[PDB]
Amino acid sequence: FAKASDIAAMIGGEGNVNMLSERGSISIDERTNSLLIRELPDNIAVIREIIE
Amino acid sequence: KAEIISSPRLITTNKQPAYIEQGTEIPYLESSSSGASTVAFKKAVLSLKVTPQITPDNRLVLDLSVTQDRRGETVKTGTGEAVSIDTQRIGTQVLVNNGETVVL
């Protein structure tokens, strides 16, 4: 129901101060409308709940 | 009385941009960069330009451009002349069920 590029630009983005991350990272897969995230297994759950 | 109908079609892959066109390209006198003229081409086409996206509950989100332009009269510009264009354009984003029609 939403574009993955917009969501990746909102969750991550310019600089690390804005990012909701510490020392991981989002990537986009446009072919299948998906995000690929690498972070602490505790931040994955809150990110998942918000973007759901 | 008068009545006209036109309908283009396309097939494409999900999340992938596609276009189909039919018309003319008008050569215009000059395009300006830092110093000189790259004379260019304006389009007067009947065109469809689309990017689709499939969602879970049997629905599509479409990013749509549909145009139908023609070549118009030749107006006067400076000491010269040039060709004008007559246009109809619509651009939107809509959300439509799988196999039915909507009026944009």
TrEMBL record, chain A:
Localisation: Cell outer membrane
Signal peptide: none
Similarity comment: family membership: Belongs to the bacterial secretin family. PilQ subfamily.
Entry protein name: Type IV pilus secretin PilQ family protein
Top-level taxonomy: Bacteria, Pseudomonadati, Pseudomonadota, Gammaproteobacteria, Vibrionales
